[PDB]
Amino acid sequence: NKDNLRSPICCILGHVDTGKTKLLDKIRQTNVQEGEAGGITQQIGATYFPVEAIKQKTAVVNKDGKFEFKVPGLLIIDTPGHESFSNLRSRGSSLCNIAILVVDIMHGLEPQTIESLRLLRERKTPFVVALNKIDRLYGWKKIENNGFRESFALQNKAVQNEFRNRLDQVKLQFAEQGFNSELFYENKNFARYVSLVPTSAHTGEGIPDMLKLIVQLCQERMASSLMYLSELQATVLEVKAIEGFGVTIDVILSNGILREGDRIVLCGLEGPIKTNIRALLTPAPMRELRIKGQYIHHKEVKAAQGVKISAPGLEGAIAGSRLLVVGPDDDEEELEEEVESDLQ
Numbered sequence: 131n132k133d134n135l136r137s138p139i140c141c142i143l144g145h146v147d148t149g150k151t152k153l154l155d156k157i158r159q160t161n162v163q164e165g166e167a168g169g170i171t172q173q174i175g176a177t178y179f180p181v182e183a184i185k186q187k188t189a190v191v192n193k194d195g196k197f198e199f200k201v202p203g204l205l206i207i208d209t210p211g212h213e214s215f216s217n218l219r220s221r222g223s224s225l226c227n228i229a230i231l232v233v234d235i236m237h238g239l240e241p242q243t244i245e246s247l248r249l250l251r252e253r254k255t256p257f258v259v260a261l262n263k264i265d266r267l268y269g270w271k272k273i274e275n276n277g278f279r280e281s282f283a284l285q286n287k288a289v290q291n292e293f294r295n296r297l298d299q300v301k302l303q304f305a306e307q308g309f310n311s312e313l314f315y316e317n318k319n320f321a322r323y324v325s326l327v328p329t330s331a332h333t334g335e336g337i338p339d340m341l342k343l344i345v346q347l348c349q350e351r352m353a354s355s356l357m358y359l360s361e362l363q364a365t366v367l368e369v370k371a372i373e374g375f376g377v378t379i380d381v382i383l384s385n386g387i388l389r390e391g392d393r394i395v396l397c398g399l400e401g402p403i404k405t406n407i408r409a410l411l412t413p414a415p416m417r418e419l420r421i422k423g424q425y426i427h428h429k430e431v432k433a434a435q436g437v438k439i440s441a442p443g444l445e446g447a448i449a450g451s452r453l454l455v456v457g458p459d460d461d462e463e464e465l466e467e468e469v470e471s472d473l474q
């Protein structure tokens with residue numbers, strides 16, 4: 131039932147500078163990419179999108195309202211594309227239920243695209259491809275934040291032909307890597323063929339189509355049990371000292387529910403850590419966990435979400451550690467053993 135709905139996790143993967151973060155900024159209406167050193171992402175990011183927002187941002191490709199939204203929302207995990215962060219792509223990939231693979235339409239598949247495809251294939255993750263930077267097609271005429279088809283229909287013949295040529299090349303490339311793919315509105319087998327959705331992070335065109343498609347992936351490809359909450363599952367992303375809270379952990383809550391005051395167990399350098407949540411915090415909706423802000427204090431947070439936890443004794447917490455909650459009925463040492471076993 132609806133009071134037990136789970137917000138799924140989507141990872142965005144792709145080669146360096148293909149526009150992962152720029153796409154998320156266009157959706158959030160933020161400017162994270164401009165603040166990044168080097169213009170590159172160097173850590174895992176997480177942003178929560180309430181379904182009310184996704185409905186608004188897909189309205190132009192859902193004008194009558196026939197599309198049925200079932201998810202309460204979606205957590206999207208941003209990852210680096212730079213060669214040196216494979217550990218982070220592997221982590222993000224292992225957390226997600228679905229994914230967006232970003233491909234620069236002007237370049238096609240590149241080395242970390244291929245790395246990413248290996249990850250998606252290994253976990254059999256449902257994904258869609260954002261064929262990004264369509265505004266670089268020579269003579270592209272934009273309508274800001276339009277659906278791709280509406281905009282494509284208005285282009286001159288030369289632009290349409292250049293588009294089709296590049297799409298055909300990118301399809302042949304996916305085929306060579308063992309994936310069949312179709313332009314999204316030509317895909318007759320959403321269950322087995324990858325949908326390609328042309329986008330521009332600069333003009334916003336196609337982003338409504340991409341958001342609709344990732345909801346569809348959650349609702350029509352992700353295992354249906356993952357639409358509802360079950361046993362708590364959570365992963366430590368980072369251990370960071372924060373002004374006025376001391377040593378905190380950033381955590382991806384993958385399943386279940388966290389509560390203020392909860393007593394939690396996780397791996398530490400010198401052994402398991404057992405402590406109490408003094409503050410259970412999130413960013414504002416549609417704002418990055420990897421960005422400093424005023425944080426929202428919660429008594430309760432439901433999965434999936436990226437959270438920050440303040441608790442004594444977090445020094446020595448180990449990034450990548452699983453995290454568990456000691457409930458009214460629990461035996462602790464068992465839990466310690468299984469997180470310690472999963473760490474190794």
Ligand SMILES: Nc1nc2c(ncn2[C@@H]2O[C@H](COP(=O)(O)OP(=O)(O)OP(=O)(O)O)[C@@H](O)[C@H]2O)c(=O)[nH]1
Binds near residue numbers: 147171212329
């Ligand atoms: N013309 C055009 N440029 C884009 C588009 N999307 C991204 N860019 C440019 O591409 C550059 C790289 O964008 P990023 O958002 O850093 O891409 P990324 O995939 O997140 O990069 P890494 O996280 O460093 O792997 C920036 O200069 C963007 O402004 C697009 O749709 N059109």
Ligand SMILES: [Mg+2]
Binds near residue numbers: 211
């Ligand atoms: Mg980035």
Ligand code: NA
Binds near residue numbers: 147168169171
């Ligand atoms: Na970049």
